[PDB]
Structure 1
């Protein structure tokens, strides 16, 4: 399923997480977004208890996109200890996301 995060739950779900966080930025109008949705869901289950994963619809939470200067999607952001550690744009393969995840673990 992957939990949704927005402007109001951001600080609590992402910035105060005790574990590395992977956030998927998407929007209904973006075709390529449908292509990584399966990978994000699979990785979330696959790494339960090890990392937190959320999805952020830019249509409904532009504030967050503005704070981190996100101007394009699909975008995947990684957070750790309250700090943004890396940003990836495009249709990212499951393998590349796994290297990054494994790095913050």
Structure 2
């Protein structure tokens, strides 16, 4: 599956003890930023153990600032309600391995 985040009250649970969650902090702007939504989902089939969510840089612009992620888009990894890695760019090369060694 795949979903986004509008309220921190949601994403807060996603990380909180729940394996490795791959949340993207795509910029509220940018052009080819929506084409990732389907991709972010395609990866959920290879790492079903990990949750593939998405962060809103418009609604949760802060969470994008807290982690210092204002790219467009960006990939954020979190283990057991904690962190693990951050690689701005879900280009077929890291977004896959990043979810392996981590999860």
- Which TM-score applies when normalising by structure 1? 0.81
Q: 1:98 to 1:92 in 2, by over 3 A?
A: same
Render the CA deviation track for 1:14-62: whole Å, top value 9, x for unaligned. Answer: 2x132111111124521131343332110113322x1011011111111
Matched residue count = 102
Tell me, in whole angstroms, the C-alpha distance in 1 between the residues paired with 2:88 and 2:32. Answer: 11
Deviating runs (4+, > 6 A) in structure 1?
none
Task: State the Cα RMSD in Å.
Answer: 1.9
Q: 1:70 to 1:28 in 2, by over 3 A?
A: closer
Structure having the higher strand fraction is 1
- Which TM-score applies when normalising by structure 2? 0.82
Alignment partner, residue 13 of structure 1: 14
- Indicate conservation of the 8 Å contact 1:32/1:90, yes or no: no
Structure 1, unpaired ranges of 5+: none
Instruction: Report 1:1-105 matches (<5 A).
Output: 2-5=2-5, 6-14=7-15, 16-48=16-48, 50-93=49-92, 95-105=93-103
Structure having the higher helix fraction is 1
